[PDB]
Design a binder for this molecule. Sequence first.
Ligand SMILES: CCS(=O)(=O)Nc1ccc2c(c1)/C(=C(/Nc1ccc(CN3CCCCC3)cc1)c1ccccc1)C(=O)N2
Ligand SMILES: CCS(=O)(=O)Nc1ccc2c(c1)/C(=C(/Nc1ccc(CN3CCCCC3)cc1)c1ccccc1)C(=O)N2
Lengths: 245, 259
Amino acid sequence: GGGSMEVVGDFEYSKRDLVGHGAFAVVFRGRHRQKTDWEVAIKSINKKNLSKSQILLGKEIKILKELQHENIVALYDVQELPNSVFLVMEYCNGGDLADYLQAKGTLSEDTIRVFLHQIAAAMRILHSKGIIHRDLKPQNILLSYANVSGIRIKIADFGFARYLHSPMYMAPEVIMSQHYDAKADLWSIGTVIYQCLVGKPPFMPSIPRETSPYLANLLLGLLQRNQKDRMDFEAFFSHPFLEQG
Amino acid sequence: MEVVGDFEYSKRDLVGHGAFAVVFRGRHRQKTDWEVAIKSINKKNLSKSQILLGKEIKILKELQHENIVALYDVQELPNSVFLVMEYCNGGDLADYLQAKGTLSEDTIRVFLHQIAAAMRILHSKGIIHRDLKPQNILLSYANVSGIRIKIADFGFARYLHSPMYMAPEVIMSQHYDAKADLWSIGTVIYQCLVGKPPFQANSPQDLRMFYEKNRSLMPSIPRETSPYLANLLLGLLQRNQKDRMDFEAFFSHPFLEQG
Ligand SMILES: CCS(=O)(=O)Nc1ccc2c(c1)/C(=C(/Nc1ccc(CN3CCCCC3)cc1)c1ccccc1)C(=O)N2
Ligand SMILES: CCS(=O)(=O)Nc1ccc2c(c1)/C(=C(/Nc1ccc(CN3CCCCC3)cc1)c1ccccc1)C(=O)N2
């Protein structure tokens, strides 16, 4: 591919419009070839690189396909050239939360609530399909502007995601450790909210005196080293902090 | 006959089921003396399951050992995915145990040598099978010394991964099942010898809570058992992986390399 343009099923991109990189991956802004006002992200993935890695792209596609929520990054198409796999995906013109925090610094409780509402919305869908993300972080949380109220949040990167499995020969450590990471996402969402508020990840941790009681409750409930002790999903989904103003 | 890439099978020659899968004996369309197993998987069924077929294909592609079941081709029709694979004319160990009952120490050594051979390759690529059992361990006759063993079913297999936002339980549980296969190989050898698994419940949940409460102690090794084989089994059947025989100890255990 010497040339500037490239065709990927019903979509196309200029190599001029590179927006960022993932693992063995490069992401371009693109568009539908007929509906050209329809912007997409095209993730090019080097096959030889992938085949030498332990990345399960098949799994990521399986999970992306299964999730059709407005706060989970949409997969539109998969194309397989000889040298590359292409994923055609929702364009998120906002970059990731990491960029937004590097710009805005720390966020208001009003802002963090608007964002967390949408992250919670996505967490519902993962929990209800028995998917654990396990690599939630600001690099994985993408932003899409209409024009703070104009900002829509989309979860991405199911590289590390895994399905919960709801046997005499099976090792006891495997039998027992079933569901052991069931609550891993609730911690991560904790560290993320924390960083949004304080301006760095936390490592009970230092909750600033300014913090509202609800938000302090949520954070201390999420940031529990032992999952046994850590807030469960339904408690989080319906936590007072989310459904006020 | 139905066609799958360069291979073909009769629907007459169904040889069993797997998960959302049906298996036929087949052959190459030119090299017709080349028998294959053709595993048909319904896509709609798969898409509603939590089976990662891509992962299993990735792992099978990476493993080219004579004691790991060969994947030759993958074909994707609209309704079905087909896996063209080594034909194992012997069925699984489950069938062979239900027939033969218990096995001689000479027989169990011949089998375990070959399972060990495969375990080398998994360990050295950092793959854990995790669901080793007699239903997964296939047999292929040339004409007991004429029986070749192939590990199958990497459905449950996973790669060993050799970060502030990541949950502590995830960080710490890295490599926790690194020795899970050595237990499984234990239960299997045990069943081969005694004629039943070392530990049984009435359900998954009974056994969950059994292993959980640490009720599990060493199991009944018959007095007749040779010392080497008893050593191996007691070293493999250790509820705590910390205590459980390490791989190099297993690979080079006295039992395997005697005559
Ligand atoms: C990391 C998860 S991933 O699955 O591997 N990647 C992924 C998945 C889905 C995606 C994007 C990325 C994506 C991004 N847009 C995007 C990126 C940057 C910018 C900002 N300036 C950059 C250059 C100048 C113009 C735009 C705009 C849109 C983006 C790219 C890389 C990293 C993060 C976001 C988007 O619209 N949908
Ligand atoms: C292991 C789980 S799986 O991966 O989903 N199945 C799979 C994977 C690879 C395979 C086979 C099956 C297969 C089988 N051969 C086969 C099957 C049955 C018989 C029938 N005899 C049994 C012994 C003698 C009497 C008739 C012969 C060959 C077989 C089929 C279903 C279950 C198990 C084995 C084979 O040669 N290669």
